[PDB]
Ligand binder design. Sequence first.
Ligand SMILES: C=CC1=C(C)/C(=C/C2=NC(=C\c3[nH]c(/C=C4\NC(=O)[C@H](C)[C@H]4CC)c(C)c3CCC(=O)O)/C(CCC(=O)O)=C2C)NC1=O
Ligand SMILES: C=CC1=C(C)/C(=C/C2=NC(=C\c3[nH]c(/C=C4\NC(=O)[C@H](C)[C@H]4CC)c(C)c3CCC(=O)O)/C(CCC(=O)O)=C2C)NC1=O
Lengths: 868, 868
Amino acid sequence: LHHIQKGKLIQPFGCLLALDEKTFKVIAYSENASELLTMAHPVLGIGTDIRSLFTAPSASALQKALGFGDVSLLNPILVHCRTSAKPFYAIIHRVTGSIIIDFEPVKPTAAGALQSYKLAAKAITRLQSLPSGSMERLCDTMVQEVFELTGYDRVMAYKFHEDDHGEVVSEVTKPGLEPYLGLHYPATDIPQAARFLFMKNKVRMIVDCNAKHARVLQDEKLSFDLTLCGSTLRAPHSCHLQYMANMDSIASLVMAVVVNEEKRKRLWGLVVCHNTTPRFVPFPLRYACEFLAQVFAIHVNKEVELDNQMVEKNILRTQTLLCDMLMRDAPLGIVSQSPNIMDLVKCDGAALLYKDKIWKLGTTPSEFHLQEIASWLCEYHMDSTGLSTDSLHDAGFPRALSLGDSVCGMAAVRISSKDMIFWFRSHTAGEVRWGGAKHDPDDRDDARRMHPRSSFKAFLEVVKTRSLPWKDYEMDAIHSLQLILRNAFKTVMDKFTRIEGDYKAIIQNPNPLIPPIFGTDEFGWCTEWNPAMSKLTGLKREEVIDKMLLGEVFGTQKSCCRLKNQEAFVNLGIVLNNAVTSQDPEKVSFAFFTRGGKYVECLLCVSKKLDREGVVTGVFCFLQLASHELQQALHVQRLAERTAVKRLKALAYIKRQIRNPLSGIMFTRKMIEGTELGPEQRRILQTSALCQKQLSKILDDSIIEGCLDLEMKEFTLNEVLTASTSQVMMKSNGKSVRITNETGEEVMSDTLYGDSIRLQQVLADFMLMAVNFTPSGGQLTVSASLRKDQLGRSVHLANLEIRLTHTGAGIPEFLLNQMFGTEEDVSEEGLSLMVSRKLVKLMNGDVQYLRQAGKSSFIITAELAAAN
Amino acid sequence: YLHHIQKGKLIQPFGCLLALDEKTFKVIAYSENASELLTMAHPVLGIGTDIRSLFTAPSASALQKALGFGDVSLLNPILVHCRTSAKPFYAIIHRVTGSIIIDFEPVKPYAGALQSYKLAAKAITRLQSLPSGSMERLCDTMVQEVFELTGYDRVMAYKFHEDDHGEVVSEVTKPGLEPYLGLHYPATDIPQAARFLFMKNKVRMIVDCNAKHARVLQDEKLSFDLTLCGSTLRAPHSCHLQYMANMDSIASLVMAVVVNEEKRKRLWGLVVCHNTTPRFVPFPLRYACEFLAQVFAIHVNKEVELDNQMVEKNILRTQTLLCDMLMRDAPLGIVSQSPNIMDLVKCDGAALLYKDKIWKLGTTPSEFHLQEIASWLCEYHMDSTGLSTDSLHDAGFPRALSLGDSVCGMAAVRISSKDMIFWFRSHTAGEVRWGGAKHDPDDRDDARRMHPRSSFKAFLEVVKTRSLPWKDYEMDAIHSLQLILRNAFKTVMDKFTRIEGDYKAIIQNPNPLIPPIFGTDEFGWCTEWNPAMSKLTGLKREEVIDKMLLGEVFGTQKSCCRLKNQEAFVNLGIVLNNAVTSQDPEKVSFAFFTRGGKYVECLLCVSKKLDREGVVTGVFCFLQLASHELQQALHVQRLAERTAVKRLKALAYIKRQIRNPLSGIMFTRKMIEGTELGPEQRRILQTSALCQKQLSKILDDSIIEGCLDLEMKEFTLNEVLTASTSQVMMKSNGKSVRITNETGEEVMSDTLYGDSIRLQQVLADFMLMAVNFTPSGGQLTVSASLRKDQLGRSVHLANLEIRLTHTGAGIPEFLLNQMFGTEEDVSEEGLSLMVSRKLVKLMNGDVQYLRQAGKSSFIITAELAAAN
Ligand SMILES: C=CC1=C(C)/C(=C/C2=NC(=C\c3[nH]c(/C=C4\NC(=O)[C@H](C)[C@H]4CC)c(C)c3CCC(=O)O)/C(CCC(=O)O)=C2C)NC1=O
Ligand SMILES: C=CC1=C(C)/C(=C/C2=NC(=C\c3[nH]c(/C=C4\NC(=O)[C@H](C)[C@H]4CC)c(C)c3CCC(=O)O)/C(CCC(=O)O)=C2C)NC1=O
């Protein structure tokens, strides 16, 4: 499919013009150029002057752009015609021996690259604020932003695989369309020529797949072949036109995601948008989409760094567990205590075969099922002590299906010639919709076929009842444990029989995970020096035995491994003395110099070498090597955790210092209760009582997210209604807001059910902001009318209905949209608004104000229970 | 006179001494007490005796092994027995030119460097747990730890000044001892010989200044002398014994503090201990103290870097003050719109003489004073541009004495021939004791001055007519502001008469603080390139003007100043659009390569430019060349600032959430106070109001520890003494304790000076514990005392004394230790008690309890003023 370079067809929505390098004269054109640019008068032929089509300012601007160095920073370029002054978006690019210009009519906002970039600022800010560490959420966010920006029928992210076949990862459509999620596609749908072109043309748009194209009447006298690959007006393949017609998608717009893997540009995938009717999008929007795709790529680059850091942390955890297991008594200690061999490698069962005695943990086959497989391993693979398989049926076990489907994956190791230790992994499930690549290896770029595909279905692919594979480090760890156990109890090869290879001959992987280790006695003399530590330092063990660890071996001068300075010496002494009284593996930064010159930086962990008698015998230290990024991440995480835990003291002090005076307040109120007064004073005391009750209940605190346990108590509306006005009217009194006693007297004549604090929580806060924009001499209007509905068996319906005034300038739109939860940076003053809204709506109520003429009215309605 | 110390042949009588030869290992020098101490209960222990003929076989072998070792400072102390009667001994060895010197010290009846370092673990972890930032707390903690570890009569930190004289910075003494804190001493008190010798032997102990010194004998056939400087038994020079007998401090132990200032090293000071009775301290304690001094020196050197970081942070704040408000309403825009010129430098007032009008701010003399100052500058300083005067009387302008103590320090800058700006600093109060240095240069003490100084209590000196000094960058900022105003209006030196006279015409302050700025218009073309940026990047203004900022100037390839990679290109284009969209300055990390090819790392602050009509006209930004460590600190700080503010806003929401019903309760109380009530009800309501005010007073928001100040006002003690004690009697409702009136009637009857909002916070929360543990039937007694003494000049001391009985089980030892701030785990009640003790300890108030027979007794003392 190479004729893309040699094709004289363009889409019929813009004109294409070609100019030489120096004379700036027309050498090629399109059939619609004369109908569009000129009409709406010399005939547009070869060599016609550019100034005869556009006005003087437009021609001058185009000339200045043509003389510029990097033309990609200037387009789009607004121009006008001669007579009608019809505007156009000139898009200029340069090819070997020519300059090609595209013209598209305007108005079917930007004039450069930066102005065009400005249209994606909201989406970029949305992308930057995302919490880091999850690729799926990032893909969903980006696809949603693209859908909102472009206004297409559907948009989807389409990721490529190693096989070169692809799968959609996210999707956002309009209601009434068939979901495309989770469907794989053959690798031959997108030929390698297309995805090779997409490294340089990162945005492609097709307006109509059923339109009538226009040919490029190139001049015959020119000796140059005008390729059209870099232009925005290319007409696609007939094969692709039929492909798009089959899917019932007419117009399309697609963007590439090129990720710099180390550089190494790799096409991660595509962001493809479809619409069922012809659609045209102006050039600045396409440029903004391209910039957004660049930002998305530089974020998916960070996601893989996070993944690598997580894997490296897992390796470090395995090393720490191995160092733990080194000390305990072998071999039963690996299984009796915790953490045991199950935590060594991610598995589902484990078994030990020591001295014809079987120790089992987790989901393991029946004890009668272990000796025969052990004997089969012994007699079939005598030339190895380790084996791995993701399916026991493939490896040749005759009785694989007789043990059930609970366990299918094996990892076995021979510590001795008779005894064994092996892990079990449960068989996994899961199938893929559509064939991945439909299993057609080797390319088929023949450019002879017309379209060997049509329609679409589910096309499920079956599985082989397999388990997850065993990684490299998950076998290094098992080899390390084998070495430890073999040494403590008193070349070879490890099989790797995976599916579709049926056999492999990997060596034992003599790269054990055992870290550098040393250790001293209680006086300070060296006692241990590992082979790994000897490799790291270049110092033989015999050089550093019966030598003082502090000063002689590690020191600032005359020492074998010279330390940085005296602060390092002091810190090493402090750590070695602190570790005597603590067993926690205190990870401390440790940096030294090798025998030659190499600044080695690691983390050091020190523990006591306790003996059987219970008396310290020395220190056991091991040294784990981590890269700069993980060390910085650990430092930042430690600081963040300390800062987070610091505020707890302040919070507790605040709560106690608010609790004590309120307790004194109930003290003085209950003690003044003895001096009784008239009935009006009794109701005033009741109002103060539930006011302080609400105070304490606010200090008595998932309720931040709106979830409520719905605590229920029996109370009647009089005190709640009085306290709602009492808690707010001091604020309005400064603003000269009067009270009208408009509430009816029939609301209070009926008994009510519901708590006092819960009911009053979602009432008073509404009008608190009212004084903010209310001028002097305002008015307050409150009307209530309880609705008695006899719905239910034991609980009636006291449907609330309250109309509250809304005077002054009131809450503006950018403060009203905060109520519905449509904003991120919600002001702290407004939090109680949506808090009360969520509290009301948890009981299927409503609290809402609508803009009216003169003054608005807040409507409050709740399905509050009735105590009738 | 270091020569006298070198050849001293006298040692203290608490240990023996033996000097042997390098090769043969025979005694060549020995002390008189050695013969009767090492061989009690008798051969010739003269020259040539072998070392092995005095100790048992294991001890002899250990000594012989220790002699043949390169770095032997890691081995001492060495245990040694005697073959005569098995007498324990510490042997401490060192090597000098041609000899090996070993000194022996007897061991009390109750093994290396690392074991000696163990006796300081608690002190080291206490020093490490402190939060950084301040020095006084560090010095106090170090002195307290040394006092607890060594058990001496008094210890004190003694810091050296640049003059080589010193001053006492902290102190801790047993009760009954006169403090020395804050004093000063002449530089001739410590001869430079000892000061130089302290960089080798970092601990010096003297047991008895009155004992009879012993003498060592050395064979006179030697060709070289014997040096005893490094030995830990050397006898001090006689005039120092007289000096020590003057203060009646018989014994002493001093520890040098050597700070390796950036590997140059400097003696920061000493930690001097004193005792009135002869004292002896074993050798491992001296090693532990030496190690703790090393750790303290490291931490001291770590807290002088935060000072430099604060200096740099303050410098990167005067470049971000009035960068654009100057362009509108110049020069009147610097006084009217805040921040004003009073924020440029740390001053007390300002004045702006322009167009014959004064726009004074803060504290400033009358207009006639300013006119007289201006006329004096115009007359007597005709060829001056700006000056800073520490005290206006030293410069001697005629009318200095009229304003007096109101204004002393001045800083004047001259805008033009008539206008100018004044900054004013008031009189500061500062006094020293014992005199600053008692100057007597040229080493007046040499081979003389047996003891021409005797006991003296104090020596008060007063320096008059001085203000705080004007720094260098504080005048660079004024110079740069003068340059800004001179440029916007369209090489001269500045006086620095600061200390005593001899005006120093510094060269135009050769450091104008002005950051490198640039800017673009709306399309993107560069318009501004100031000389600072042109100097930083080595690029002329012409080569950049009329180009494009993105792509042509800052671009990945073929650009004037190439960027690092492509991720640094899409991050500069993002900020140039957010700056316009949001208009608020944004600070980001920047990095690039100059024309010469040097990597530059900066911070970029970018903000939007508007015209008079509020229309955005472009963008202007400037570079803040932060230092490496400052950049990393700000990076890590801003990494978690988002989470910090996210928690802060959530915490602050509850403030309003609880203030609203607090407003309701105040409303109800205020309208219930409007009814007819008896005296008892009135007193109840007054107590309720007093106990309620503390909620709002606490909710004003540091709040945990530090930055705490107590308000002061005139009040009667009856109200608080009743409200605080009444509000707790019913807290233990389930125990029914008995409370009866016990306070003295002479403490209620008087009014005084002091806030009642924190008196409840102090003496009402203390009695919460008394009901938590005491069972039913507990009796509580409160004793009050108001000592009215006139121990002052303008304030009458109405000192408050509180006594509380402690029934029940009482506070255990671990809970008690929390009150003193010496524990990591502090309970909420313990945290509140510690906070209250700190809150009362600023004005010399002691809160404690002592356990007696039956019930313990509390003592609370607070120095309080009287408003009589
Ligand atoms: C949902 C996934 C999806 C797929 C797999 C898809 C395929 C696709 N077809 C693409 C490319 C091509 N696809 C083909 C041809 C074929 N596609 C098929 O279905 C056949 C295997 C083959 C016809 C022989 C050719 C020649 C191209 C080159 C593009 C051109 O010259 O116009 C592209 C590239 C984007 C574009 O140029 O518009 C896409 C995105 N379109 C989709 O919507
Ligand atoms: C509280 C401040 C304080 C000061 C200023 C003080 C001075 C001092 N005097 C000290 C040292 C000396 N200072 C001197 C000399 C003189 N001191 C004086 O008062 C004269 C100026 C001079 C002799 C008359 C000498 C001979 C020494 C001891 C040197 C030696 O014995 O070889 C020291 C160091 C401690 C020691 O070396 O044992 C101290 C601490 N003692 C204090 O406690």
